[PDB]
Amino acid sequence: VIEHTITIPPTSKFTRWQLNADVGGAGIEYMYLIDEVTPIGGTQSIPQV
Amino acid sequence: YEQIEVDVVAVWKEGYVYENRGSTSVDQKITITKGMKNVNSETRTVTATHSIGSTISTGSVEVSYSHSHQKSQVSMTQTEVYSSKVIEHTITIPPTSKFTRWQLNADVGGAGIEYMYLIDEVTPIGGTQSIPQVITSRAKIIVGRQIILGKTEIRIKHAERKEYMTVVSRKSWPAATLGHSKLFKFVLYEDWGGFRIKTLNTMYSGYEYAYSSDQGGIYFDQGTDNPKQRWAINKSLPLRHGDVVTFMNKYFTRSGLCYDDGPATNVYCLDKREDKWILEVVG
Amino acid sequence: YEQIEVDVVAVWKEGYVYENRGSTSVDQKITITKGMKNVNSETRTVTATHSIGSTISTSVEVSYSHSHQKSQVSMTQTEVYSSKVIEHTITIPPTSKFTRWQLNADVGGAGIEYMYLIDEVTPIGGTQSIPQVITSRAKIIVGRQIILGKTEIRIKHAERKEYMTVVSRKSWPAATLGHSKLFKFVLYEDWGGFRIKTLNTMYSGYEYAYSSDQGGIYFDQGTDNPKQRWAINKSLPLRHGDVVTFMNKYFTRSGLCYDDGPATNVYCLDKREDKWILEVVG
Amino acid sequence: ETRTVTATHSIGSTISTGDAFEIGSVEVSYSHSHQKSQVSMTQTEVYSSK
Amino acid sequence: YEQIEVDVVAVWKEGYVYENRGSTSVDQKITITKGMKNVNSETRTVTATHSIGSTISTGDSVEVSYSHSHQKSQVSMTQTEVYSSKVIEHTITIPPTSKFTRWQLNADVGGAGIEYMYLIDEVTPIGGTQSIPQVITSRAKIIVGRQIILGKTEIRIKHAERKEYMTVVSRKSWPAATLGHSKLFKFVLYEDWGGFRIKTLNTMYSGYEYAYSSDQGGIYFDQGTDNPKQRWAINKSLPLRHGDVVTFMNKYFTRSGLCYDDGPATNVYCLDKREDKWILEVVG
Ligand SMILES: [Hg+2]
């Protein structure tokens, strides 16, 4: 079980991207979580890879 | 690394409005839960039964005696996998204030990815409500290395099973089956007839293009024009690392590349079936 | 982007009134929950028995038998669950009444609804005001319009979350569900109703979705046939992301749906009418 | 909704004697059954609480 | 806006005593729970079986048998669950050299026919001799419903458990009682020396208006006779008031009372050992 508690300030957006990381050659892999709080607006940046 | 700009288009899925009309504030907590469980069992029973009977016979009198012996053996294997995402938001809604939750489903164009999109706001009561049924916005997407058709070498991974497409020998032909080996490379081609999956690890030279037998099994053939060794993709080009793709057969239009537990191999092409595959560029 | 003004109409569903007449305050916490669980299983049993009997008779009779049963149950289960829990914590002051009204709010024209909750604390006394139905105004931000005859769309099965595609069954083009994002359509209306036209047929001119006499969906040449004509659930305009229903103009009881048939899985069956999402292509 | 389908195959046989002098007889039976069974279940739950 | 003064008699049901003899204090939490759950299911099964069989034999030996069966089964289930809880939780700090006592009694309010749970907690120093209440009488003022004047005030009759109203329909060309959602079916109650009578105001056959029990149990509406079959005994003392929970026992068939049962075409009956609860509501 993994739990994250964050305080989101007003007029802000929260981002969670979950990637699966593949370590090359080693043949191992891990879960990769990216959390971010930014102000509302701008241009969204999404990591596909 | 390259970046492409797209529109994200989010569509309303659900809503909620709450009004606190009083002069004391209120503490609101919303918990949203989604989860899944998968159970598989195999139960093997064996019973052995022995019976010895007899009848003594001669009005008329009959006498019967009977004896039963049953031995039984049940072997059970159950296996469970579960997951849950729980998501909770707690807010203090001030007096004479109105809280709105809108939940939309956001589709990222081109990327073939989607995400849940929640908009919360507290405002004073009054004005008129603004509901977003459909929202368009812009996004930069950090994208994978491009799969150059004909050139770049890739692995094909079954999405659900997390095993790779491997070449083995069935009926004296090279044939597709799922395995753990990271050694089986491929290259993808497009022509007038569709897409072609070429293996670089065939045990019979020249027999390298993936194709469907009239039975469904995937074999690897020599290069012909036959639509049986051609395939329809699910996406628009370019293909990139990590892309979730589908291969529908160009001749057997009803059917696509899937996993089935067949007699010898386990990669087939069957009506109403198209499992997702993950393409990954080798280093 | 366009934005339409509309009335939202909410009708009373449920209510609750709490009076704290005491001279100490009370901490009240109302907590509401709705949830779903869907369970699916397939159980395969294979069972094999061999018996050898024997009787010697003359009188006296003597029997002996032996059986060997070998059985194999294979079951696989799928569970999918969800819930929404809403908690509210308030301090009701001394000599105060708390009232909660729960309404169901229908947004006109848009075909979407939401839960509307009204909490209020006031002094004890006055006349209770109960909202059985409230109308209010809303501006709704809507999707790009699906212009009939013109704009290219995808048709997605709402429940199965996969797309409507064209494949060959018995040498005609036929509808099946697929993962491909490459199967486009254009919608037409004339005085006979709505028509679904595929831009991805493998046999030219055969492009209008129609119901066979068995129920399967194929694509025909444009005729006047009511069997190739469809009744939607909302009125115009159609927009991106609209949830729609396709009922057949000919077999009036039946509508476009999923069913696991022999070769394809898109059908037109009595009493069934699945929901589809229309997406305007980028 | 629970849907069950069962296919069953049985082959049986008896070898016996009688009026074969020394009065009295021996009988011998043999049978084999294969049964194949598929059950499909759909369950849906809806719950609430205040 | 009528109010009547009366005694409530509360009677001991359960007790508990705690002594803290130490010189540090203690934090005590009593927590009591009552609940119910009702489960209702319906399971419909349909099995179709085909069997094809055969035997090849010799006479004047060897026998050879073969059979095949195909069996199709369809099981449909509907389950209904409904539940409730009440939890009462008390937290107290008992100081040192202190005794805590809890008495639970059950209070019966006289005349009104309502009851409530009555809890008495007390912390005192250890010593003295205990006072235990077995039964306590106290006075109370009851704010009561608008009165049902017999012969005059129009009332409706609600099944307490099912929350549906007694309505009048036509069964076998007679006015018959059935349960239904209509707030349109009004009644008026009468008492004479024979007992109590239910008169409908919504009969479709004029004059056939007083509730009676047929020889099979069903509730019909007859002309006003002297027949004890159209008379009923109530559970409460007079007067009847809006919101009163009542019983109707038949004056003729004394073992039987007015109840719900799922019958051939109607569902309001008069059956042995059954007496359903009814709520009486004064119309506007
Ligand atoms: Hg269907």
Residue numbers in the entry:
A (entry chain G): 100 to 148
B (entry chain H): 9 to 66, 73 to 297
C (entry chain I): 9 to 66, 74 to 297
D (entry chain A): 50 to 99
E (entry chain B): 9 to 68, 74 to 297
Wording from the paper:
One of the few described eukaryotic members of the aβ-PFT family is lysenin, an invertebrate member present in the earthworm Eisenia fetida. Lysenin is present in the coelomic fluid of earthworms and is produced to act defensively against parasitic microorganisms by forming pores in sphingomyelin (SM)-containing membranes. Monomeric lysenin consists of two distinct domains, the elongated N-terminal domain (pore-forming module, PFM) that shares the fold of all aβ-PFTs, and the C-terminal β-trefoil lectin type domain21. We reveal that lysenin forms pores using nine subunits assembled to form to a large extent a smooth-walled tubular β-barrel structure flanked on the outside by the C-terminal domains.
Based on the crystal structure of the monomeric lysenin, five negative charges were removed from the proposed transmembrane region (Glu84Gln, Glu85Lys, Glu92Gln, Glu97Ser and Asp126Gly) to create the mutant RL1. RL1 still readily forms stable oligomers in the presence of SM-containing membrane and successfully captures and translocates DNA strands under an applied voltage potential. The homogeneous RL1 nonamer was crystalized and its structure determined at 3.1 Å resolution. Two nonameric oligomers were present in the asymmetric unit, packed in a head-to-head manner. The RL1 nonamer reveals a mushroom-shaped transmembrane pore with a central stem built of a long β-barrel. The bottom half of the mushroom cap is composed of the C-terminal domains of each protomer, and the upper part, named the collar, of β-strands originating from the N-terminal domains. The β-barrel is located in the middle of the oligomeric assembly and is built by nine β-hairpins, each resulting from the unfurling of a significant portion of the N-terminal domain of each protomer. The height of the pore is ∼11 nm, of which 10 nm belongs to the β-barrel, with the widest dimension of the cap 12.3 nm. The inner surface of the RL1 channel is mostly polar, with negatively charged residues framing the top and the bottom. If mutated residues in RL1 are modelled back to their wild-type counterparts, the inner surface of the channel becomes almost completely negatively charged, thus neatly explaining the reported exclusivity for the passage of cations as well as the inability of the wild-type lysenin pores to translocate DNA.
